[PDB]
Design a protein around this ligand. Structure first.
Ligand SMILES: COc1cc2c(cc1OC)[C@@H](C)C(=O)N(C)CC2
Length: 113
């Protein structure tokens, strides 16, 4: 239980919060991979080269894929960046991304040193 383990516990706590009922009203678009075909978004995978979502982050955390907090944060921010790249900035889904990213960034900032 070095610094990396302690920081990954903080990351796991954040992940649990992002998936919690407290944030469900704006977190739900990020729960599962974007289903482009189901949504009729036939340009999604031409625009987004590296899809990411909270179920994928959860699988990677469960599989001990993340070696440090920075690697975890990069996936969570990739998920938000994909949303900001693909969707017009006035769309409800972007408002929901902004709100969940505020939750993420303020708690990520409280990382134990
Ligand atoms: C609320 O409407 C939308 C939901 C979703 C998306 C887009 C939506 O509005 C167009 C896709 C493209 C997206 O970025 N995520 C993150 C998944 C779901």
């Amino acid at each position: 239980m070095g610094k990396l383990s302690e920081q990954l516990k903080h990351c796991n706590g954040i992940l649990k919060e992002l998936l919690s009922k407290k944030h469900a009203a704006y977190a739900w678009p990020f729960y599962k991979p974007v289903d482009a075909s189901a949504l009729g978004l036939h340009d999604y995978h031409d625009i987004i080269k590296h899809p990411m979502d909270l179920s994928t982050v959860k699988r990677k955390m469960e599989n001990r894929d993340y070696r440090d907090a920075q690697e975890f944060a990069a996936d969570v921010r990739l998920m938000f960046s994909n949303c900001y790249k693909y969707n017009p900035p006035d769309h409800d889904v972007v408002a929901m991304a902004r709100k969940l990213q505020d939750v993420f960034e303020f708690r990520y900032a409280k990382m134990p040193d």
